[PDB]
């Protein structure tokens, strides 16, 4: 699709049986989801934004479905105010910014 | 143009006599520039992001040139880690996300 930017570009994603609303975010290097449980090993990471840093858990090789696209990558979990799909996954769905 | 997302989507903008690097950011409602001394009135404002909130100054109807497009709108100024072009100005240049 072509997604206009009049409103926040929110989409529903699926992660192992769970639906989540997430923001397609060209200003994010990484994908970050609000606190939730995920299987497998993880390691702590600090990520920064407007307003400073937060501690997140880093989970690698997680499969997610985003707008009908089945992708696999790193998912960070922690206190982001909104779920974020970052460039690590936007590149996998073939997303570009067009004007 | 069609901007891929393998690297951060940074562009040069021109605001008055100043040239700056800025991030084309679909995850930002508003445009926020690093501290600078713009003409005219301003209202203080709080904005939130990944690490919490920061305080900024809101200036309205400021002209900026972005990728050869002249836009005129609201610019926030404050301690942002990177200059950000948000959806308020992305829409004025006719930006969409495509995949």
């Amino acid at each position: 699709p072509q997604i206009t930017l009049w409103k926040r570009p929110l989409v529903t994603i699926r992660i192992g049986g769970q639906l989540k609303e997430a923001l397609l975010n060209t200003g994010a290097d990484d994908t970050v989801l609000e606190e939730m449980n995920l299987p497998g090993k993880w390691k702590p990471k600090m990520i920064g934004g407007v307003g400073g840093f937060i501690k997140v858990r880093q989970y690698d090789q997680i499969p997610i479905e985003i707008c009908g696209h089945k992708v696999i990558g790193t998912v960070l979990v922690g206190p982001t105010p909104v779920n974020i799909i970052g460039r690590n996954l936007l590149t996998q769905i073939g997303c570009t910014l067009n004007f | 143009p069609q901007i891929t997302l393998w690297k951060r989507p940074l562009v040069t903008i021109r605001i008055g006599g100043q040239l700056k690097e800025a991030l084309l950011n679909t995850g930002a409602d508003d445009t926020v520039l690093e501290e600078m001394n713009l003409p005219g009135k301003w209202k203080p404002k709080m904005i939130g992001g990944v690490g919490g909130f920061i305080k900024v100054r809101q200036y309205d109807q400021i002209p900026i040139e972005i990728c050869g497009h002249k836009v005129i709108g609201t610019v926030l100024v404050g301690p942002t880690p990177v200059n950000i072009i948000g959806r308020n100005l992305l829409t004025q240049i006719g930006c969409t996300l495509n995949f």
Binding site: N25, V50 | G27, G48, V82
Partner: peptide, 8 residues
């Protein structure tokens, strides 16, 4: 940084 989500 990271992750430049921003809102008002």
């Amino acid at each position: 940084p990271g992750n430049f989500l921003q809102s008002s």
